[model samples]
Target: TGELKNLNEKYEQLSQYLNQVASLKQSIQNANNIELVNSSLNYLKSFTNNNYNSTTQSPIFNAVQAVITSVLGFWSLYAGNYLTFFVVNKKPASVQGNPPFSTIVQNCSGIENCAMNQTTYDKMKKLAEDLQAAQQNATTKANNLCALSGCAPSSTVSNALNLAQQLMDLIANTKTAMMWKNIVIAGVSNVSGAIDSTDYPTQYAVLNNIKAMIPILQQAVTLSQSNHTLSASLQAQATNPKFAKDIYAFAQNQKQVISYAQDIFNLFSSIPKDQYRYLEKAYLKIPNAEVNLNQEIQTIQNNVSYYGNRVDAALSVAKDVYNLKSNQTEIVTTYNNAKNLSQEISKLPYNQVNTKDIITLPYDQNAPAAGQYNYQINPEQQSNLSQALAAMS
Candidate 1:
């Protein structure tokens, strides 16, 4: 009789746990679906407001806002129900402090830290497993719940539980690609020092660094291209005129910088060591070498300054337009270092070589024509940029 009574209690407990799991699962599904709907509606609202004269009293705006409110209200109710059930049932500590479904979705938006919230997903999965274990234990002892039908989760519930993990992976991968892109940019910025150096060994070292970065840059490009969702998001963001212009300018400037790096590498590789030494010794004997070399060096220095200024300008525009969150002090310091190196190199008497012979030596180049580095936005686009800037501020 005692065994029968104990079995009855176990059966009751297992039934109650199963009911709670079912309710929690339903609540999560409802909250997740509603939040997704609300996000779509909000995006639509933003588009409509951007295209039309939307105001507080506007009927269309009010209608969208009302729907958003209703959706949020329902989400809140479901989240509250889930929370109440969790706390009242004394769910395991592993899943404790799990925020409501809508909160997780909201936190994952943007480039915030929670964008990589793997902990929440892990906890959710742990909770699901914990519940399943408890139910199975009770069912084994009572031999009732699973005797008729299985206690495993429905396909819908299983998929709902897996959604957070999938979302986390997507965000993590996209963030990684963005990180690599920034690294490539910084690597290009750091190449200026090597380009400014007059030492062959220093130039050779810089050439090696550029060679290594080419593969990384290709990887970054491939990662960005493969992530269609992220690419689409960026495309949508590019609809703003100022942002589009800034992005275009940044890309163009970076492309030019990469081209310059490649040219320097090729020039360095093409020069034979014996020829380099021969020019060094031969140029020393020329009476007019100092004057001609100074003129050539000055021309090269002017080109460096011209292109450097354009790159700096484009980077600054991107920094402001994108509201870049990373520290830009390193970029500024690199440019300053390049400028200081250029000035010091210009002052060195050893830089004086004959103009004709210097042309035969590696690193000699004619001055670029006017507007060669120009990447200016059109006047109409400039006006649009100003409007976007004003709206942002």
Candidate 2:
């Protein structure tokens, strides 16, 4: 009987040892899984920090802005000189010398068809009015020159005026595009900071921020390409001044002005389309990154919850085996806190968001009429950045 009791005790000890060994192996596996999860999260954090934060000072923005500013400078000079040559200096020699190349307002008292003269005078008056309005904000000036009765579609004067109007519109579009670019930079900075935060609310805020900015960034990309296209068109028109060549016969100074304008236009045109490629690349990364980041965060949250529940279960088993419940309160409390955090994280709709649904590009479809201009950046896009900045603050 004594031998059997001893054998039974030995068997129980061996079985408990095996159970402990198995538990030890399972714990090791859990630790390994947690480590892997942590490492991946770290990698994603580093990747986002490097990619998004580093671009805040990207030279591409400066390069693009410099190009736009330089182009605008040349445009301002060309418009100023062109207007001066045509409207101010080209006065008629005693109202009989070649019917005055001047665009200045004039009276026609004795001309046959005084009504026709009045019609032309009114058009010229409108042009003068627009020029004066342009002084306040030049890019908003109307395309009135081609609207005049005698300015034929293929005429030299019409072509010259068309080039002028195109440049003005291009400048305006590029400037607004640059403004959108600025907003993108700011938005990236906001997102970078938000990613560093540990709270659920900030993470949720970041998802919305990303959603808001995707369209704005897309607009910037579109506008950048559009600006390049307009620049190329301007280059083509300036290079082949078929009908516009007649402006050379007006005066030596007028010829010099046209030459200078063409040279400047060519200079602006020479800017490569690749200059804005950086913006496109940045835009393409954002939605994907958001998806990857949310996925990583979800994975980490699940791991945390799993391990936390395991620990809580172990502690609960110990309490029951020992028939003691004291000192396990803090452990239980900590587990519950982690559980709450995990639940909150899971409640976020970020993981459910479809990047495609959020990132639709608003392409411009309505083609402007001849001698008319349109804007790619609208008022809502312009104000979106301000709202985003406000929310961040």
Candidate 3:
């Protein structure tokens, strides 16, 4: 009974508001103050939405607002224009007057064109008014749920990203998985997508954690490869005897690898991004980020080979220039140092950045002195190292 009275009260208020709207239009002449008229129009929009988010107000507001955007153009035009017969529609015959409104009759100018013509505008106006009344009379409606669920042809998907973590952790627990894991991982691609779409905040957080872990595995592979290459390269010292020269060449290789890793890590982190509603068709580069990352690594390897060949060529030059000797120990010192550094790089955790500075390696107290090698470290290496360190910021 109380609910009935409340609905009646709302209906009365709605009727009064509509009547006031009509009466105001009747008296309103030419609106010279477009600014004031514009303000009033904006206020009308607000009134339509005044209860849009309210428990009682929202559903009524939503239904009305949607209709306004879709079908209220005629009524709004009438209100905003001259106030003759609040014709409520664009139809000539159903306009409720004998000659129809000037706006309507003028639209259809003929001698005997006064018969009632049932137009879509008339039906739409009737529907709009009925909806307004129903909104005033209604007692229950789930406005938010209706708005959210209006988008259909959508299927329920996995909220549990258990498969993702399992797939990622498989790389750590089993090496065979790494070979075939990217395939399985590609399947799990839409797993977090489903989770994020829903309002599951906790699951979203956990899903983020799962997403963050993928790079850890791929970087692990990089680290392992780097280490193994280091060990093998250092063992090459047996082939060349001038240790200091080899060390210099090895330092150059280290520079390339570290720099490549730095750039690759940045590109990797930049791939995934938050979606902005208005900015549609934003193509994120993450999918291509991995492709580019792998390509960069390949390029880095190619550079390593180029630099390594230069080192070998330099060794050949030294052999001829200084009169070659197999027993001179260039192979032992340089190969061992270079290979060991490579191994160090490879063995470091996937998450770690290469912190070794080629400029400082020779000057370490435990490392051999520059005077013993009879080679002055390049001035630019120190400057380059400082620049690289500063870039770490």
Candidate 4:
């Protein structure tokens, strides 16, 4: 329980750190300032992970060593030298402690060396926030849809809203997942021009660690896939015909309800001309989402029809099997009763009558004065006729 609490606290702190990192990453748009941007964040990471151990040493020794190290660290800062013993050994300064993350934010806030455009920062920040909001909202919407196992279906609305929500959630969640992966890719890809060749190895090491932190990306993709499968299963069970009839329902409903494209456009207003390409991915994929859904609607219709045919075949067999056997038994009993009457008539006939022809009874006649001569046959006569016919056959 104690360990779980500690882990939970760490996750909460990490979430805060990630939010700050995202915000600062936009602000420090200068490719050159990425090193400085990460410097104090290293300290923040060390501070947050209190149980962090960098060396194979005993706790008592390490704790005592930390006290001496802290004093020296402060003295180095005070003497206008944020240098460390690690630097003397040609190691990264981040391996030794530096300032807090907040101090780094202050240092990089208005540096002329960064040479960044405020317009791009503003746009990136706004869009990042927008995407974050979209992610949260998608979770809520998808959860609600998934929870509605027994909810009433609207004859008019159909399942279009459900499909649209699921699709949007897929794209938005995927976008965020891809962004984490691309953040590292972009840094690594731009290595030659973006970083000082002197700082390459340490930064590359840091980027590798960032790469290791992306199990969540794959996990997000898995979650979306599972939700999609579930929705498809539920959809098949409902077999709501309305799902297929409306091709544009999802696309139109998303416009009035979610306005996802509009949100992107609104963010685009603040974005620099060059940076607009970052958002072009969403622009291209939106139409594809609609196209895929239309195809799925057709698939659903085909499946429902296939199942309907199977049901009718089953019902036909079920109806005839019981009734046919029962009818045969009744016909045999009726034939016995008429045997003596026909024999007596034969004795009194003017000429030798064809008794077999005379005994041919009206088997298919209707019960009189009825709306439907459907199930209740002429109880005694019908049985006798059915029995005689069965015996003869």
Candidate 5:
């Protein structure tokens, strides 16, 4: 209970920091928020000072580290709240890739403001369905290949033809997955934008998209598991001396497809029911958050622009009183910097509108020392697989 209480406190602190950091980040150009700005600067500084690595086994600590990365402004991307959230689950929000399917589906569930058009929704549904069907076919093919009695290293059952067909299948499966994944994050952005603007018809399309994704999530989980098992069998068969060359390479290469499947399975596992619900609620908040941010940017811009205008007014006053004929360089420079900062904040809100719609698929570092990567084939397992494949003779 004590540890849980401590965890709660840590969570609350992170929440508080997120809100304050957001407010301060947006209000940086405001002349009146100097204290808030300074506070966030120091907060960020302390975070940087801490040795915050991913060595901790706690998801709670991982979440904190994710926010710290955003606060440190590792890149300009985290200026968006959604981007900040993205870092916790995947790559940097600014990275050029789509989030995983389930994340997008959860966020875009039409029950709330998330929606997509029927045409796009149908297309996404087809892509996912196609992928599942392809995986099943591949699994069947793999099983058939393994069961064949003529597998005695004959030139007739050339490993070349066999590997080629397997390659073709792997390519097709991967192509479909990539096609589905590419649309997910970008689709969410477009759909949420429509819903936020109260575009009812467009919202229906997005709602349809969400519906399409629901079945895909189930499909992905089910088929990916099967595919992984199929991969294990293939890999096991490849380890045999009889299949030393082409089959071995083919089996090892199939891990590429297997890895992606694991990526999806692991991604889904990382997000619990509560986390998904939290994400959905958080998704809804983005529209309001962006609107508030735009207001803040307007305030900052007006403040800085007024200051710049005041500078001009002051130069004229000096020209008349003290015979100063030019813009005071120090004041002029500071005003320019202030104006630039305000302009910078102005661009962030537009980018952020697209951000609240973004989601993440967990990125696999595939570290060897961490014992986290599941794709690695241990020598003992390899030897057993080799013996099993030899016994098939």
Candidate 6:
């Protein structure tokens, strides 16, 4: 626990130092242009997000919502947001994403406040239905895929195709998750704005639509990626010649992913029992521990993920430091070596060495030994790296 707190503290410290360093970088670099300094600062801010994608943002919504969605989705797309709570089993105070009548109603009420007309609610219902249907269909597909392989699967297929599909699927899935998220966050903002403007019918309809769309979107995001991963993986046998005969094993891997997706889909789509069934019959209610525990576990996982990422990031920075220092050293050594060769040529009889033979020894210097770097530790300028790490909390 102390270790966690220490990590927490270190992350904060690092974050604060990251900020301070940015400020220092700008203030020193931009003594000439305030606007440029500010622009650089804003640009750098996006990098702290693990999912930093400047291109992913567009002005479909107001800048504020754009930023909020980015921040929320940044947390969710990578670390996950309310899902963190849902995964933890904590009743996260969310009105939009997940279920329980009370939560849905609260969100819908908000949506209602923002809607422009009754028709929107009607559309929302369709979206909701589409989402449910999609989930069911995906489950069916997954089950079929799984059955073909009898549940045994191969682990290695073409890493190339697998990587391509995974990356492409991730690209699609992330955008898809984001697409609806934009709709919801923006939809609510729009409805809420309308509510502020006192547009009732519009708001009411919007709320209903918002409520309707919620389930579908969740179902869609959850399953589409699940199915896509399975579907892409399924084709590995055909993608590479090496995998042709490993058909059963190939089918097995595909099947397992499909099975996993199917289970998830079924979990999401299965109608809640009209009443508690087995739990009631046995007087042994399995609390919704998995739901919240998963959320918390997701949170632990998320926090772990953040720390885990920092491990790589800190390592990367360390690597970059070496690279930069080595480059500079090489540049300087090159100049000196050139000067020496030129002097040596001057000393030699003009006829002694051919001009071509006078090749300046290549810009050679011992590479700063791996991991060693030459950088100033200006303790007076800012926090030391350790203290900086501590501040990330």
Top TM-score: which candidate number?
A: 6
Evaluate residue 385 in candidate 6 and report its C-alpha lDDT on the 0 to 100 scale: 36
User: Mind giving the per-residue lDDT tens digits that candidate 6 earns over 1-393?
Assistant: 554454444334433433443343333333223354233222222222221112122111111111122222222321121211111122233323322334223333433222112232223333333322321234443211111111252111122122222322332232111111112122332442322222222122222221232233233224323433333332211112222223223233232322332333233233233111211121121122211212322332333334334333333332333234344455345434434443443354422222222222222276443222222223322343334334442
Instruction: Name the lDDT value of residue 273 in candidate 6.
Output: 36
Q: How many backbone clashes does candidate 2 have?
A: 0
TM value for model 3 = 0.19
**Stretches of model 6 off by over 4 angstroms after superposition:** 1-118, 132-307, 310-318, 321-393
> Model 4 over residues 305-357: C-alpha lDDT tens digits?
34324323322322222233343344333333344444443454341223432
The residue-level lDDT of candidate 2 at 207 comes to 22
Clashes of 6: 36
> In order, what is each prediction's RMSD in angstroms?
38.6, 32.9, 37.7, 32.0, 34.1, 22.3
TM per prediction: 0.17, 0.17, 0.19, 0.17, 0.17, 0.21
Q: Which window of ten consecutive residues has the lowest lDDT sum in model 2?
A: 175-184
| Candidate scoring better on TM-score of 3 and 6 | 6
Model 1 ranges off by over 4 Å? 1-255, 258-277, 280-298, 324-393
Better of 1 and 5 by TM-score: 1
Error in Å for residue 126 of model 6:
1.6
lDDT of 3 by residue, 142-231 (tens): 222221112241111110112223332431232110000011123232344311221211222222332453343234224323433432
In model 2, what are the clashing residue pairs, if there are any? none
* Alpha-carbon lDDT, every model: 0.30, 0.28, 0.30, 0.27, 0.28, 0.28
